[PDB]
Ligand binder design. Structure first.
Ligand code: HEM
Ligand SMILES: [Mg+2]
Length: 301
């Protein structure tokens, strides 16, 4: 009499991932059977590749989740709005599929199974292949993940809903960034460090009263009466060396509120100041999704 989390939320240190974002082309009923088939396929792939430490998540946009749930639960869910009056684009789609493991080849086979399950019921808008770079650094050269929640216990506390109809579920936020590494390389290392709020090589936090309020850490390390607004990030670098490249941002939270407060801060809506990382990288997509618990995917029908 309890709820099970979808396998792709809590895995830490996974080296590769695949994110598929898509729109629903026909009746929403096609998603019910397809989602059951896909979670069945994920269990089959986990049994076939135990050393991959494979996990996956199927999550839904506001319009299709309100239809599938009958308007019950997911009280915070809404279409991703535009932040900073345009600085952050909105590209809200209906379905998000997040696959992560220690083996990219296994993720590829799982992605093909997801596409076969949903079939022509969906219109794929985006497919991004994430990879962990050297020393878990973002392509800018700064380590990404240091203050991210560590261990299954704290990650569950931050990302997984505790009780009620949505017990075992989570809110998802995805946003693809395009880095301009030529513009980053024009900045001196000390100026890049003041932009992030941590040192580049050693990955040491620069004190809050020593760094600009526009620094990344000053924008996203938010507290409400001393209580941190934490999120579980699963972001990874992506792209080609000669073409488009950057960071595919992905975060899970039991409360959509924590993610929104950080976006309001980063894009100038809270105090009129914006994130200093906008000097070299920009967001080009944006969407909010609800990841139900495993058994609520089984009760779709
Ligand atoms: C280009 C896009 C982004 C890059 C390169 C990036 C990079 C980084 C880096 C280098 C860190 C510091 C190390 C760490 O603790 O993980 C960091 C921390 C963090 N980032 Fe970002 N980030 C990006 C976007 C975002 C977005 C969109 C959000 C949230 C909406 C976010 C939320 C956070 C949070 C919560 C932390 C930890 C802050 C703390 O408590 O110290 N980031 N990120
Ligand atoms: Mg802190």
């Amino acid at each position: 009499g309890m709820s099970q989390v979808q396998s792709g939320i809590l895995p830490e240190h996974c080296r590769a991932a695949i994110w598929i974002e898509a729109n629903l082309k026909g009746d929403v009923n096609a998603l019910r059977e397809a989602s059951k088939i896909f979670v069945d396929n994920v269990a089959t792939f986990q049994a076939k590749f135990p050393d991959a430490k494979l996990g996956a998540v199927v999550a839904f946009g506001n319009n299709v989740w309100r239809q599938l749930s009958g308007g019950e639960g997911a009280d915070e869910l809404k279409d991703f709005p535009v932040y900073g009056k345009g600085l952050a684009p909105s590209t809200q789609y209906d379905l998000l599929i997040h696959i992560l493991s220690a083996r990219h080849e296994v993720n590829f086979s799982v992605a093909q199974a997801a596409l076969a399950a949903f079939g022509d019921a969906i219109d794929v808008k985006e497919e991004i292949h994430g990879f962990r770079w050297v020393e878990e650094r973002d392509l800018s050269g700064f380590v990404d993940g240091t203050e991210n929640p560590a261990g299954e216990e704290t990650r569950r506390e931050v990302a997984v809903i505790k009780d009620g109809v949505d017990a075992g579920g989570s809110y998802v936020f995805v946003q693809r960034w395009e880095h301009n590494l030529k513009q980053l390389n024009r900045m001196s290392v000390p100026d890049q460090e003041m932009m992030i709020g941590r040192t580049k090589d050693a990955n040491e936090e620069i004190d809050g009263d020593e760094r600009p309020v526009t620094s990344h850490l000053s924008r996203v390390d938010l507290k409400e009466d001393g209580k941190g607004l934490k999120i579980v990030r699963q972001s990874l670098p992506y792209g080609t060396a000669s073409g488009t490249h950057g960071l595919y941002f992905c975060a899970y939270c039991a409360r959509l509120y924590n993610i929104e407060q950080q976006l309001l801060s980063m894009f100038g809506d809270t105090d009129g100041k914006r994130d200093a990382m906008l000097r070299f990288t920009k967001p080009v997509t944006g969407g909010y999704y609800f990841a139900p618990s495993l058994e609520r995917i089984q009760a779709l029908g």
